[PDB]
């Protein structure tokens, strides 16, 4: 079991950005072109809980698949919360969600990454280049809008 959590500041409108990924998350595609390729639905609606997604994308030039369900969605904390079921994540995590919340309050304006997972041996890394890669889409996003 292990947890990673990053903050980012971000300078554009943090209610935009949240609802890119609580509505509209295929948009990343557009906004992040280097790094994600692909954001399709397999099953279920965009911006519902339940929801299938499948994202192509591309890490150190690598090319990689996660299908994701989207397990949770919080207007209050301005939350979402995504599983990964199938990829290449799961070739090393038994477990490994996803959530990115959005602080509006005040002047504060900031993205939190959280990472919860689960390894499948003792000996796989801890996932900082993921985390990395979900800092450089954010920083997209924000530029894209800005």
Same mark, same amino acid.
């Given at each position: ?38 954001? #399709?639905?397999? /099953? ?6 339940? &929801? !299938?997604? @499948?994202?192509?994308?591309?890490? +150190?030039?690598? $090319?990689?698949?996660?299908? #994701?369900?989207? /397990? ?6 301005? &939350? !979402?919360? @995504?599983?990964?079921?199938?990829? +290449?994540?799961? $070739? ?55």
């Amino acid at each position: 079991s292990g947890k990673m959590v990053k903050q980012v500041e971000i300078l554009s409108d943090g209610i935009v950005f949240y609802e890119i990924f609580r509505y509209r998350l295929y948009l990343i595609s557009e906004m992040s072109p280097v790094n994600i390729q692909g954001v #399709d639905l397999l /099953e279920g609606n965009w911006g519902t809980v339940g &929801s !299938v997604i @499948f994202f192509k994308y591309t890490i +150190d030039g690598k $090319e990689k698949t996660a299908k #994701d369900i989207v /397990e949770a969605i919080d207007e209050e904390t301005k &939350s !979402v919360t @995504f599983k990964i079921v199938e990829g +290449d994540l799961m $070739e090393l995590y038994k477990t490994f969600i996803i959530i990115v919340q959005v602080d509006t309050k005040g002047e504060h304006n900031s993205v939190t990454w959280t990472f919860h997972y689960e390894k499948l041996k003792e000996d796989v890394e801890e996932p900082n280049t993921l985390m990395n890669f979900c800092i450089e889409i954010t920083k997209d996003i924000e530029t894209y809008h800005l």
